[PDB]
C-alpha cells in the first residue's frame, strides 16, 4: 500500500526542528547515515558484465590472444597488484581483471598461468600480512570479499606451469633470434612476454620461499632477487608494445564489483600509471633483498638495530610483515631454531655479563639462582616481542605505541632491580640487569622523542625545550649507562665503541641545536603564541606525560626544568654571541667526532651533511649578521629527519 | 563593513551554515551531522553575519571521553572566500574557546588536512599544539593532523 500522500502532508506539519525517533535513537545512530543522494556518500552511484556473462557475449577474449593484448593485460594486472599492495581495497583494484575471477575458464596457457601466479602471490601476501598483524586500520585491506584465490592448485604446480609457459616461449624467442620489421616486432613482443612471465615466477618463488618453515630457503631467494633486476630492466624497456587503456582496457571491468563494496563511505582508489610500475617493483625487490639478510644476525641488539634501520626507510606494508614473520616464524621460536630465552641470555652476557650467566661463577650451578634468573628472563621475553612488533608498525603509529610500552618496561625495570638485589644478597654484580633495562628504556625514550621531529609534531617555539631533554638529561643518562655497561664488561674480563661514538655525536648535535634555539629566542627571532592563554607549564607537562610512568630516570617537571636550563645561573648571564659560539663549538665537536670514526656508514654521512652547513651558518651569524632582523629562520628537515639545517 | 558575531538561535540559520561548510570543507557531512552538533550543544555554535547574510560558521562539541577529562571538540570551521584574512575565523575560535572554558573544559582537539597551511598557521598563532599524525585519515587522501590545546 502507498502512503506517500498521507506521509508528506503529515511530515509537513512538524515543529521545524523536531524529530520522530521514539525512545532509543538520538542523533548518534543517526550519525554515519549514508545519504543516498550525494556523489561522495552513496557508494553505489557501457554495460556491467562479469566474466561468466562476458565469455558468451564475446566482448572478452579467452582463446588465441594476441601478444600486445597479453602484454597490456599483464602490465595492467601488475599495476592493480601494486595498487592493492599500496593499501587500496582488493575488490576495487586487483579483481577488476575479469580473468582472475575464474582462471579455469581461461584457455590460453600464458594468460591462465599468469592469472594463477597473480592469485597465488596475492594469497601469500595476504597470509603473511595477516600473520604478522603489523598493519593499522588504514594501511592494508586484507578482506577478500568472499572470493576464492587459487585454493585448488598447489603453489608448486603453479610455479611449474609458469616455468612451462616460459619454456614454450623461449623456443619462440630463439626461433626469431637474429631484417624484416614485422618479425623484429614479433620477437620483441615475445621477449617482453617472456620477461613478464619470468619476473612473475621469480616474485612468486621468492614469496614461496619466505612462506617455507626452514630458514635455509630464505637465503636461496637472493639469486632470484638478483635475476629480478634484469627481468625488470627488460620489462621496463619493453613497455610501449602492449595495448593501451581507454579510460577500461579490453578485458577489465572497473565496476564489476558493486554488490561487494562496503556500505560505508567510498574512498575511490586510483590505480597508478604504467610508467611508475617498474620503479615500485624494483624498490620492493631491493627491500626484500634487505629483509633477507636478517637471518644472519646472532644477537638481540643487532636484530633490534636492524629493525630500527629498516623501519627508518619507511617501507611498504608487505615488506614489514615479511620481516616480522621471518624473525618470528612461531609464537616462541626465533628463526625457527633458537628459543628467545637463550637469545635474551646471550644478549645479557654480551652486554653486561652478569655473574649468574657466567660459567665461572658459583651462581651458574645454584638451584635457586638459576630459577630466579630464568623467571626474570621469562618475564622479559614478552616486552621485547612487543617492542619489535611496535617497530614493525608505520611511522605515524610508532609514537603512541612507544609511549605506551614504557609502562611494561618500567615494570620490567622494577622486577630486574628486585631480582638483582636479591641475587647480590645471595651472592654475598650490582645494577647489571638494571643497567641493561635502563639502556633499553633510554633508547626507547630517545626514539620516541625524535619521532616527534620525524613526523613534524613540534612547533617552532617547542624546539628549545625538546632538545634540552634530549641533551642534558636523556643522552647524558644514556652515556652513563653505556659507560657502566662497558666498564662492567672490562671489570669482569670494543663492541660498544661505535654506539658510544654515535651517542656522543648525537648528544653534541642536540646540545648545539638547543643552544641555537635558546639564542634565537633571546634575540627575538622565534614566533610565540601571541594570544589566548596556554601556559608553557601545561604544554611541557603534556609533552612529557608518557615519561611519568617510568621511575628511573626520574621525570623532570616544569619547575625543575627551568632551574636546570636557566641561563641566569651563569654570572654574568651570556649574551646571544656567547650562545652562538657555544653552538658552533658543539657542531665542531660533533663534526670532529664523526670524522674520526672509521668506516662511515650511511647514517654518518647524512648527519655530516647537516653539521657542516649549520656550523658555517652559526659562525657567520655569530658575527652579528642579520642581528636586527626579526624574521623567523627557516628549518629544512630534508637533510636529516631529526636535525634540521638552520637556514637564514 | 561591520562584522557581527551572533550565537546560534534557531534552526532557521541551518541553511546558512550548510552552504558555508559545503562550499569550503572537503569531507562530506550529512544534514543529520549538523543537526546533532547544533541540537546537542547549541551554546558552542557561533556565526559571523554581515548585513543580512552569513560569512562565517564555527560548530563545536564538548563531551567527556573515557571518563578522564572533559574534552572539547571543534568540528567545523568556515569563512567565506571574499571575507577571509579579516580575523573572522580567529574571533570565532576565540569565542568557541571562551564558551568551552566557561563550560569547564579540560582540552580542545581538532583535525585538519596537513596541506591546509592557513589553518595550521592560525592554530599555531592561537596556541594550538600538534599532537598526532594520521595517514590517509580523510576521504581525499591528505594526511590529517590532530591539534590540541591543553588547558589543564
Amino acid at each position: 500500500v502507498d502512503i506517500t500522500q498521507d506521509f508528506e502532508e503529515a511530515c509537513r506539519e512538524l515543529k521545524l526542528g523536531e524529530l520522530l525517533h521514539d525512545k532509543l535513537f538520538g542523533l548518534f545512530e543517526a550519525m554515519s547515515a549514508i545519504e543516498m543522494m550525494d556523489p561522495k556518500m552513496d557508494a553505489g552511484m557501457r554495460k556491467v558484465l562479469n566474466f561468466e556473462q562476458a565469455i558468451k557475449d564475446g566482448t572478452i577474449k579467452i582463446k588465441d590472444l594476441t601478444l600486445p593484448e597479453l602484454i597490456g593485460i599483464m602490465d595492467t594486472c601488475f599495476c592493480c597488484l601494486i595498487t592493492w599492495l599500496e593499501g587500496h581495497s582488493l575488490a576495487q583494484t586487483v579483481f577488476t581483471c575479469l580473468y582472475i575471477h575464474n582462471p579455469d575458464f581461461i584457455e590460453d596457457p600464458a594468460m591462465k598461468a599468469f592469472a594463477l601466479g597473480i592469485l597465488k602471490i596475492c594469497d601469500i601476501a595476504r597470509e603473511k600480512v595477516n600473520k604478522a598483524a603489523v598493519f593499522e586500520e588504514e594501511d592494508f585491506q586484507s578482506m577478500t570479499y568472499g572470493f576464492k584465490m587459487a585454493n585448488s592448485v598447489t603453489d608448486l604446480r603453479v610455479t611449474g606451469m609458469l616455468k612451462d609457459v616460459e619454456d614454450d616461449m623461449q623456443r619462440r624467442v630463439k626461433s626469431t633470434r637474429s631484417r624484416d620489421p614485422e618479425v623484429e616486432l614479433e620477437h620483441q613482443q615475445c621477449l617482453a612476454v617472456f620477461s613478464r612471465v619470468k619476473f612473475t615466477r621469480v616474485l612468486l618463488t621468492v614469496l614461496i620461499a619466505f612462506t617455507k618453515k626452514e630458514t635455509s630457503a630464505v637465503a636461496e631467494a637472493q639469486k632470484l632477487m638478483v635475476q629480478a633486476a634484469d627481468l625488470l630492466s627488460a620489462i621496463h624497456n619493453s613497455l610501449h608494445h602492449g595495448i593501451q587503456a581507454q579510460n577500461i582496457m579490453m578485458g577489465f571491468e572497473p565496476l564489476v564489483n558493486q554488490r561487494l563494496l562496503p556500505p560505508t563511505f567510498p574512498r575511490y582508489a586510483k590505480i597508478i600509471k604504467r610508467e611508475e610500475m617498474v620503479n615500485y617493483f624494483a624498490r620492493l625487490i631491493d627491500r626484500i633483498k634487505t629483509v633477507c639478510e636478517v637471518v644472519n644476525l646472532t644477537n638481540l641488539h643487532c636484530i633490534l638495530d636492524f629493525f630500527c634501520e629498516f623501519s627508518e626507510q619507511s617501507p611498504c606494508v608487505l615488506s614489514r610483515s615479511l620481516l616480522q614473520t621471518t624473525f618470528l616464524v612461531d609464537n616462541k621460536k626465533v628463526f625457527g631454531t633458537h628459543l628467545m630465552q637463550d637469545m635474551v641470555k646471550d644478549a645479557l652476557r654480551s652486554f653486561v655479563s652478569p655473574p649468574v650467566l657466567s660459567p665461572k661463577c658459583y651462581l651458574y650451578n645454584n638451584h635457586q639462582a638459576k630459577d630466579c634468573i630464568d623467571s626474570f628472563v621469562t618475564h622479559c621475553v614478552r616486552p621485547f616481542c612487543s617492542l619489535i612488533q611496535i617497530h614493525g608498525h608505520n611511522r605515524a603509529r610508532q609514537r603512541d605505541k612507544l609511549g605506551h610500552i614504557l609502562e611494561e618496561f618500567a615494570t620490567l625495570q622494577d622486577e630486574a632491580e628486585k631480582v638483582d638485589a636479591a641475587l647480590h644478597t645471595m651472592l654475598l654484580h650490582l645494577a647489571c640487569l638494571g643497567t641493561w633495562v635502563l639502556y633499553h628504556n633510554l633508547r626507547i625514550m630517545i626514539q620516541y622523542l625524535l619521532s616527534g621531529f620525524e613526523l613534524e609534531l613540534y612547533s617552532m617555539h617547542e624546539y628549545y625545550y625538546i632538545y634540552w631533554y634530549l641533551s642534558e638529561f636523556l643522552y647524558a643518562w644514556l652515556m652513563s649507562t653505556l659507560s657502566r655497561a662497558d666498564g662492567s664488561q672490562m671489570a669482569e674480563e670494543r663492541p660498544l665503541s661505535r654506539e658510544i661514538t654515535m651517542s656522543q655525536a648525537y648528544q653534541n648535535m642536540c646540545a648545539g641545536m638547543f643552544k641555537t634555539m635558546v639564542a634565537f629566542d633571546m634575540d627575538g627571532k622565534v614566533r610565540k603564541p601571541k594570544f589566548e592563554l596556554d601556559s608553557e607549564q601545561v604544554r611541557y607537562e603534556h609533552r612529557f606525560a608518557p615519561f611519568n610512568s617510568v621511575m628511573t630516570p626520574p621525570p623532570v617537571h616544569y619547575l625543575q626544568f627551568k632551574e636546570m636550563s636557566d641561563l641566569n645561573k651563569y654570572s654574568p648571564p651570556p649574551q646571544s654571541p656567547e650562545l652562538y659560539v657555544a653552538a658552533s663549538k658543539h657542531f665542531q665537536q660533533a663534526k670532529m667526532i664523526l670524522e674520526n670514526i672509521p668506516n662511515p656508514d650511511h647514517e654518518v654521512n647524512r648527519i655530516l651533511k647537516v653539521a657542516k652547513p649549520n656550523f658555517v651558518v652559526m659562525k657567520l651569524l655569530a658575527g652579528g649578521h642579520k642581528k636586527e632582523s626579526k624574521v623567523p629562520p627557516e628549518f629544512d628537515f630534508s637533510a636529516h629527519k631529526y636535525f634540521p639545517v638552520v637556514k637564514l | 563593513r561591520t562584522i557581527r558575531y551572533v550565537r546560534y538561535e534557531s534552526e532557521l540559520q541551518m541553511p546558512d551554515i550548510m552552504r558555508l561548510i559545503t562550499k569550503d570543507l572537503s569531507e562530506p557531512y550529512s544534514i543529520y551531522t549538523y543537526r546533532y552538533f547544533i541540537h546537542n550543544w547549541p551554546q558552542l555554535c557561533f556565526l559571523a553575519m554581515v548585513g543580512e547574510e552569513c560569512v562565517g560558521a564555527i560548530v563545536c562539541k564538548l563531551d567527556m571521553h573515557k571518563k578522564m577529562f572533559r574534552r572539547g571538540y571543534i568540528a567545523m570551521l568556515a569563512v567565506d572566500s571574499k571575507y577571509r584574512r579579516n580575523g573572522i575565523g580567529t574571533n570565532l575560535v576565540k569565542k568557541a574557546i571562551y564558551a568551552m572554558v566557561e563550560g569547564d573544559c579540560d582540552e580542545v582537539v581538532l583535525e585538519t588536512e596537513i596541506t591546509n597551511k592557513s589553518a595550521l598557521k592560525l592554530y599555531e598563532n592561537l596556541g594550538f599544539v600538534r599532537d598526532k599524525r594520521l595517514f590517509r585519515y580523510y576521504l581525499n587522501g591528505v594526511d590529517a593532523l590532530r591539534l590540541k590545546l591543553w588547558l589543564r
Binding site: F265 | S26, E27, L139
Partner: peptide
Amino acid sequence: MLGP
C-alpha cells in the same frame, strides 16, 4: 574537518 571531522574525519572518520
